[PDB]
């Protein structure tokens, strides 16, 4: 009796709604309390519905042995799992095992970090929610710093699935569809006005034909990442425009699987042009001569 009192005390003195703080078992009150203290601790070393709502991802801080000592509130809006559920638990218990090693390397030891990691997701496309066994894997783009006992402070953005777009799109982005040999099976039609290519010309051409050579290596790794994990965001890179010169693009890509066959059909690319044509004096390629 006399401890149940002080457990409800601590709970309602956690930074929580009276609502959610009532419901906690004691192991959770331990976890959350400890994570809160740990977290405050890291904060001293470093130094809302707006920021939270304007983010397209969640913030998380993970110790070097993998403990997830803080997860921003809105994580549920993207993974379905909640701050109360996961706080204090290992990142490795909620990520794809074939990513665990990469995660390990990124928790460890320049301070900048950027990778992709598959994490369990229990919210469904459009609204609904499932149970932890019915969990899908979702790829997250993680960028932050490792920092000093060591922590990893990252922002994790889901990569919007191109079939399911909550988010609108401007004139300066266009879609493209590729064979798994990265050929052009379909391309949007603003590609002309933005770069000058007609879709016909591109089809059955390997995207490698249009990379600035200085990019190609970077691009292949992105591709390999895309195939290991299922989504990816490229770094920025320049596509050879048609009449000489080039443009700064940045593409996010998705393999799409055959839902009946269960094999993968192709790759959907959403392509963000970041510039006009640059250096159209210069002809880099054979295409830009004709």
């Amino acid at each position: 009796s006399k401890e149940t009192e002080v457990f409800y005390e601590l709970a309602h003195e956690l930074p929580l709604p009276h609502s959610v703080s009532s419901h906690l078992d004691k192991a959770s009150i331990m976890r959350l309390a400890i994570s809160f203290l740990r977290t405050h601790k890291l904060l001293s070393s470093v130094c809302d519905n707006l920021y939270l709502k304007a983010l397209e991802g969640f913030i998380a801080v993970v110790t070097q042995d993998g403990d997830m000592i803080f997860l921003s509130e809105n994580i549920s809006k993207f993974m379905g799992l909640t701050q109360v559920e996961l706080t204090g638990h290992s990142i490795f218990d909620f990520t794809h095992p074939c990513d665990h090693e990469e995660i390990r390397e990124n928790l460890t030891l320049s301070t900048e970090r950027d990778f992709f990691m598959r994490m369990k997701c229990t919210v469904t496309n459009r609204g609904r929610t499932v149970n932890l066994k019915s969990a899908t894997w979702k790829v997250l783009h993680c960028t932050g710093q490792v920092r000093v006992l060591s922590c990893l402070i990252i922002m994790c953005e889901p990569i919007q699935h191109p079939s399911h777009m909550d988010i609108p799109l401007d004139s300066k982005t266009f879609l493209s569809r590729h064979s798994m040999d990265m050929k052009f099976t379909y391309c949007d039609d603003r590609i002309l006005e933005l770069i000058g290519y007609h879709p016909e010309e591109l089809l059955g051409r390997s995207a490698y034909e249009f990379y600035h050579a200085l990019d190609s290596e970077n691009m292949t790794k992105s591709h390999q990442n895309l195939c290991t994990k299922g989504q990816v965001v490229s770094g920025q890179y320049r596509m050879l425009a048609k009449h000489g010169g080039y443009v700064a693009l940045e593409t996010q890509g998705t393999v799409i699987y055959n839902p009946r066959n269960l094999q993968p059909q192709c790759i959907m690319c959403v392509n963000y042009v970041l510039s006009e044509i640059e250096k159209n004096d210069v002809v880099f390629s054979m295409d830009q001569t004709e």
């Binding site: 457990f7 004691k26 400890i34 470093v46 304007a54 040999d181 700064a248």
Partner: protein
């Protein structure tokens, strides 16, 4: 269970190790209570974004583009006074060619897009912006931050890509090399050598071989020139995409 209690104890120990004023269970349960009663913070979430994403927040009227607000994080992110930004227009802070894109994102939901902003103490950095439209209209957004020349050939030796530096290395415009066989620029006596190199890098697929040969400049003079080079294969099909070459004026 047995370890159930053991991990509740490991929690308790962990607590006592983190509460500096800090005994038994009831006590640490209550010393924690008072020690947090002393003390996520609002303005600190900001520092979290700054540290993690290198992002700063700003709110701009939709109708005009007026900066109704900018968080001071703008100065670590963009090397900008808060004064330089606040009370201004978003079109003022972006690349001129990003003006149009920008207009579309501010018409009468979520918003997400990319754009070059100005920094300084005329240079631009690329900026990912996310956020949403609230009434007042306005946009609540976060902006975070992110000797030789090189040639590609088909397996025949046809230039299919050169960087502008060929002009400085051999005198030619890129157009005067593109479409032609590198062997056509090779001195007779060396052409077999060049071709041996080209049969070899393809057979020794993947690896870098290097070869030296004379190269007629735009002015006809023979230029000794070392090209290390290697095949590039498609990651999926392993088909030879092309040969990559780095042609260094020896």
């Amino acid at each position: 269970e047995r370890r159930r209690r053991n991990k509740m104890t490991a929690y308790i120990t962990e607590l006592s190790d983190m509460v500096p004023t800090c005994p038994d269970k009831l006590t640490i349960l209550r010393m924690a209570v008072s020690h947090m009663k002393s003390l996520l913070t609002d303005q600190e979430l900001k520092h979290l974004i700054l540290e993690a994403a290198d992002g700063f927040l700003f709110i701009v009227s939709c109708e005009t583009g007026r900066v109704v607000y900018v968080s001071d994080s703008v100065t670590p992110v963009l090397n900008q006074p808060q004064s330089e930004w606040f009370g201004s227009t978003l079109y003022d802070q972006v690349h001129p060619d990003d003006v149009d894109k920008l207009r579309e994102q501010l018409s009468t939901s979520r918003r997400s897009f990319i754009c070059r902003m100005r920094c300084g103490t005329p240079h631009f950095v690329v900026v990912h912006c996310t956020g949403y439209i609230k009434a007042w209209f306005c946009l609540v957004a976060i902006g975070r931050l992110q000797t030789e020349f090189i040639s590609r050939h088909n397996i025949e030796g046809i230039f299919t890509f050169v960087d502008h530096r060929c002009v400085a290395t051999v005198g030619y415009q890129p157009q005067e090399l593109l479409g032609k066989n590198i062997v056509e620029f090779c001195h007779p006596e060396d052409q077999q050598l060049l071709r041996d190199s080209f049969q070899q890098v393809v057979k020794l697929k993947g690896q870098v071989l290097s070869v030296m040969f004379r190269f007629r400049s735009k002015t006809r003079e023979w230029l000794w020139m070392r090209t290390s080079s290697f095949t590039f294969q498609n990651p999926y099909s392993d088909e030879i995409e092309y040969i990559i070459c780095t042609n260094t004026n020896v």
